[PDB]
Amino acid sequence: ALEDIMVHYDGTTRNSLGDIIQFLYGEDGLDGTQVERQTIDTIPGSDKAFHKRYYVDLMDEKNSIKPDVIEYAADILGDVELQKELNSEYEQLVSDRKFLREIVFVNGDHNWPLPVNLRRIIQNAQQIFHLDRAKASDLTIPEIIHGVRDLCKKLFVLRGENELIKEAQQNATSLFQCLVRARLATRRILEEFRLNRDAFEWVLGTIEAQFQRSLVHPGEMVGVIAAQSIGEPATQMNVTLGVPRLKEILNVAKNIKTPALTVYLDRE
């Protein structure tokens, strides 16, 4: 059935004729082995939990950075020039929370298979850079903000500069940038993890390189791998399930044996 399907050098999915099937491979451009199930932390929990973990406040003293972890802590409190940065970024994350809450992952089950797992890189830098201490750091909040925002435009899946390229770029890695901002927000980094500058720059460079190395390769005969890797649990496997249900779904019957409805009722 599939034996010619080849992902070419434009991230699309054609047969021998050129019947394009998916405009972007697997809807993401990501090689199928290269995922782990991770936790997009900004889905679950209450508004209290989010507003307690993330909401920066630079006017009130105590809800700000407890000043033991940063060197420059004299240079901060009250400045609205940096408060508007952080309000924009908190509204950014409320936008992402409404996004991943109400568009994509509606029922809120947050565990999803998503590529390169950053937490492991963070704790790898931690064990490399001896990251206890419980020590002041010299890495500023505006460098965090500009690092995240200058990250989210460097995850080129679909390269080039036409309008549909940039549109398909932002359609492509919305969920992955949502992941990064779901983790590497300012209060989480500078309280719960306690990086320094050099760790953070290494984190930025490595997320670059490995989300480059988990792009799908061109010519991965995905139909063939796909067909085998669906046939393989079919080897070792009141509604009909198993092999006849699979047969009917493939050979498409107008008469399957026992059809069914999923009928919701209205909320009242």
Partner 1 sequence: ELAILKEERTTTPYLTKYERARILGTRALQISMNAPVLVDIEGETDPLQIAMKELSQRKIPLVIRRYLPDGSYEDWGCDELIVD
Partner 2 sequence: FGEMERDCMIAHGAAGFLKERLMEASDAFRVHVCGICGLMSVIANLKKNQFECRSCKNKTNIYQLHIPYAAKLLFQELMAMNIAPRLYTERSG
Partner 3 sequence: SQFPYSSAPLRSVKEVQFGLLSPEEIRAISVVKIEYPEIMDESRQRPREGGLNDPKLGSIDRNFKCQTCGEGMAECPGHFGHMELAKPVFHIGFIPKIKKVCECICMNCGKLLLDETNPTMAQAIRIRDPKKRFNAVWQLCKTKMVCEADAPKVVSRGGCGNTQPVVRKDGMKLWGTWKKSRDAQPERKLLTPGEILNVFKHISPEDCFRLGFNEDYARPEWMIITVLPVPPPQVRPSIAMDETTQGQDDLTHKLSDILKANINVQKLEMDGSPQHIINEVEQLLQFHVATYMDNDIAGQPQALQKSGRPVKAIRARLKGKEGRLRGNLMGKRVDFSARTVISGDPNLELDQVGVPISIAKTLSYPETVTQYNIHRLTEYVRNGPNEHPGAKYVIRDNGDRIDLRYHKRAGDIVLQYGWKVERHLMDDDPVLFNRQPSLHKMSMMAHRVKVMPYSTFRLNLSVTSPYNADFDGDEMNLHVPQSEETRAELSQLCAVPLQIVSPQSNKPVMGIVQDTLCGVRKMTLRDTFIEYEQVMNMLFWVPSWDGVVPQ
Interacting partner of 235 out of partner 2, partner 3, partner 1, none (Cβ under 5 to 8 A depending on kind): partner 3
Using CB under 8 A as the binding rule, whether residue 113 contacts partner 3 is answered as yes
CB of 226 to partner 3, least distance (A): 9
Interacting partner of 33 out of partner 2, partner 3, partner 1, none (Cβ under 5 to 8 A depending on kind): partner 3
Binding piece for partner 2, criterion CB under 8 A, among 43-51, 192-200, 215-223, 239-247 = 215-223
Using CB under 8 A as the binding rule, whether residue 228 contacts partner 2 is answered as yes
Query: What residues from 30 to 59 belong to the interface with partner 3 (CB under 8 A)?
Result: 31-36
Question: What string of DSSP letters covers the chain?
Answer: --TT-EE-TTS-EE-SS-----SSGGGTTB-TTS-EEEE-TTSSS-HHHHHHHT---SSSSTTS--GGGBS-GGG-TT-HHHHHHHHHHHHHHHHHHHHIIIIISTT---EEEESS-HHHHHHHHHHHTT------B---HHHHHHHHHHHTT---SS-S-SHHHHHHHHHHSHHHHHHHHHHS-HHIIIIII---HHHHHHHHHHHHHHHHHTBPPTT--HHHHHHHHHHHHHHT-----HHHHHHHHHTT-SS-SS----------
How many residues of this chain interact with partner 2, rule: CB under 8 A?
Answer: 7
Choose which of 215, 221, 246, 256 interacts with partner 2 (CB under 8 A): 221
Q: How far apart are CA 42 and CA 131, in angstroms?
A: 25
Interacting partner of 113 out of partner 2, partner 3, partner 1, none (Cβ under 5 to 8 A depending on kind): partner 3
Determine the residue type at 110: H
Interacting partner of 10 out of partner 2, partner 3, partner 1, none (Cβ under 5 to 8 A depending on kind): partner 1
Using CB under 8 A as the binding rule, whether residue 228 contacts partner 3 is answered as yes
The residue among 247, 182, 176 whose CA lies nearest residue 214 is 176
Q: Which CB sits closer to partner 1, 161 or 268?
A: 161
Using CB under 8 A as the binding rule, whether residue 259 contacts partner 3 is answered as no
Binding piece for partner 2, criterion CB under 8 A, among 56-64, 182-190, 223-231, 247-255 = 223-231
Using CB under 8 A as the binding rule, whether residue 233 contacts partner 3 is answered as yes
Q: Which CB sits closer to partner 3, 76 or 221?
A: 221
Choose which of 94, 168, 224, 256 interacts with partner 2 (CB under 8 A): 224
Using CB under 8 A as the binding rule, whether residue 3 contacts partner 2 is answered as yes
Q: How far is CA 126 from CA 70, 130, 165, 196, 243, in A?
A: 17, 6, 37, 9, 49
Q: Which residues bind partner 1 (CB under 8 A)?
A: 8-10, 12, 14, 18, 159-160, 165, 212-213, 215, 217-220
Under 8 Å CB-to-CB from 179, ≥6 apart: which residues?
38, 40, 114, 118
Residues near partner 2 (CB under 8 A): 3, 219-221, 224-225, 228
Residues near partner 3 (CB under 8 A): 31-36, 113, 224-225, 228-229, 231-233, 235
